[PDB]
Structures are given as C-alpha cells and as structure tokens.
C-alpha cells in the first residue's frame, strides 16, 4: 500500500539547545508531503533498498515489529548490521550473518552493543561509517494511518560500525502496520520555541512559498 507523510520525519539536527529562533539546517530529511510505502503486520516483511537513508515508522497495538537487518548483499559474503528489541532489552550486532530464508524472531561480529494505540517513528542514516538512529514515540487519536500535524525525532543511538548499507529489511515477532520513506539532502528551516523544542518546520524545496 501507500500513504502521504504530511509534516513528519523532522529530527533535531545537532545536540545543541536553541530557543525562540528560526534555524536553517541542511541534512538527509524525509521531504514534507512525500509518499511512503505502507505494509501490514497482519493477515509482510520484504527486503527494501536503503538509498541515502530511511525514515521508518509503525502504528501499533501489540508490538509485532521488533528489529531490522542492513547491509549490501545480505548473504554472509560481508559484515551485516542486525538490530533487535527483546522486551526489556536492545541488542545490536554486525556479524557475517547467513540469515534465515524468511526472517522472524521466535516467540565476524566486529562490533556489538546492548541496552491503533500508538505511533513509533525512527530515522536511520549512514555517514563516515557511523550509523545514526533518531526516534519518537506517541499515542495517536487517528485509528487508521500516519496522523497529519507536526512532531520531531530525537537522537538515541550512534554506532561507529564502519559498514556499507544499500539494502535493509524489518523483523517480525512470530510463533498493527508499518511505513518506509527515503530521506533526501534538503534544507529545512526549523522553529525552536521558547521551551527549546522544534515545534514547526519548512521543507525549503517543497513549493515556491517554502522557498
């Protein structure tokens, strides 16, 4: 399926507090009012290209989506990033995995790291061998789909993995719906409010009024 992203996939561009200011930034962002490919965690876990980087999101009620695979060939010829949540914990690996024929979680590892009702939103990008993760989580009033209106994603994790990514996939817990949108190098103008928070944005290349 498909839907439109509206005013979504903005994130804090750097770890600096700013307030009462309109700040210009250029980065890999999800474009405003872009299409996103839509998939259903019911009745759906295909391989995806990664391109420059990915916004990923899920609208949820039971936590079916729990992880991701990233790499180039995904066939044990090279190191490949694996990310998983297992209830109270997060686990991350980069082994030369020979993956399953149809990847699910059953209800050289040169790096390792450890730690509808709702919408979960994530951004993934790879720069200078660092893999960067931003996210936000919220309740939602719209039952069906991604909500219209504005919210911003915060950096949680940043991993010096030194690995190439051009394909990715998502992992289901097996014995809700989820969304994919590619980032683009865009100038955005960000409204930081009195309380340090990004509360509005302009995607400068959206339309002539945005320019």
């Amino acid at each position: 399926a498909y839907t439109n992203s509206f005013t979504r996939g903005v994130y804090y561009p750097d770890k600096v507090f700013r307030s009462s200011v309109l700040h210009s930034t250029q980065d890999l962002f999800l474009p405003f009012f872009s299409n996103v490919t839509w998939f259903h965690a019911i009745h759906d876990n295909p391989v995806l290209p990664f391109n420059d980087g990915v916004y990923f999101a899920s609208t949820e009620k039971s936590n079916i989506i729990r992880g991701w695979i990233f790499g180039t060939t995904l066939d044990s010829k090279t190191q490949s990033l694996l990310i998983v949540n297992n209830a109270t914990n997060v686990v991350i690996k980069v082994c030369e995995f020979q993956f399953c024929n149809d990847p699910f979680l059953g209800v050289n590892c040169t790096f390792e790291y450890v730690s509808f009702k709702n919408l979960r939103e994530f951004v993934f990008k790879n720069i200078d061998g660092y893999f960067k993760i931003y996210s936000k989580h919220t309740p939602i009033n719209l039952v069906r789909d991604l909500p219209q209106g504005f919210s911003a994603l915060e950096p949680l994790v940043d991993l010096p993995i030194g690995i190439n990514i051009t394909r990715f996939q998502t992992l289901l817990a097996l014995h809700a719906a989820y969304y994919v949108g590619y980032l683009q190098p865009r100038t955005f103008l960000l409204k930081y409010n009195e309380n340090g928070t990004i509360t509005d944005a302009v995607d400068c290349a959206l339309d002539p009024l945005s320019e």
């Binding site: 804090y12 750097d14 770890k15 600096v16 507090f17 700013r18 307030s19 200011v21 090279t78 190191q79 050289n108 200078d128 061998g129 660092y130 915060e154 950096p155 010096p160 030194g162 690995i163 190439n164 309380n195 340090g196 928070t197």
Partner: protein
C-alpha cells in the same frame, strides 16, 4: 617474510583477487613494517566522556569567572537557569554561535552564561 600482513567513503572497510601480502623481513628503510594508530576525536555536543588529567575546581555562581566546561573555555557570570535542556543536549547557543548556557558535567543542572559587565567610557 611475514606474509600474514596484507593490503587492498571515510572509514570504509572491505573484506586477480584483491589481497596482496607484505614481504616483511628484517633485511628490508621504506620497505620495513610500521605500526600505525589513528586517533579520531568526537568533539560533538553530547556529554564528554574521554577527558584530560586536568583536575576540576568547585563551581562559582553570580560572580564573573574564567570558566572551562569539558574544554569549553570562556569568561562570564554563571547563573542558575530555567532552560529545559533535552537529555541529549550539553550546551545552548546564541545567534552569534557563542555558548549561551551549559549543563555541568558532575551535577546535571543548567547554567546561563552572562558576559561580565562592560560599556564605553
């Protein structure tokens, strides 16, 4: 020689065919093995966590001081502040890029930096 040593974006890794092996023998100067360490320093505005041996003083407030936070050298009147820094943010900036507020590294409170009193004479 010691043929167990071999060669082939920024910080790229990749694992006729591509590998060639060094003939490292003691008799080899440019043909001899060298070890190399490259240190990359992550300056970014998160909490600092690899710091020099330089010992911390006590804190001072409402008085003009020559401060240093995590290597951010400056001068100003430090004062407590209402600025809601989000958990990932260590510093806040002015329109001029100059740091306007900081979070202290030992006690996680937020200080405004105000430049010491000045004017034309």
């Amino acid at each position: 020689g010691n043929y167990n040593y071999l060669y082939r974006k920024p910080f790229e890794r990749d694992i006729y065919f591509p590998l060639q092996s060094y003939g490292f023998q003691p008799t080899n100067v440019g043909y001899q093995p060298y070890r190399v360490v490259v240190l990359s320093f992550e300056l970014l505005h998160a909490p600092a966590t690899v710091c020099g041996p330089k010992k911390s003083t006590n804190l001072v407030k409402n008085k003009c001081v020559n401060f240093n936070f995590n290597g951010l050298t400056g001068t100003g009147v430090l004062t407590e502040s209402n600025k809601k820094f989000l958990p990932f943010q260590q510093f806040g900036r002015d329109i001029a890029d100059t740091t306007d507020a900081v979070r202290d590294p030992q006690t996680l409170e937020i200080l405004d930096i105000t430049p010491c009193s000045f004017g034309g004479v």
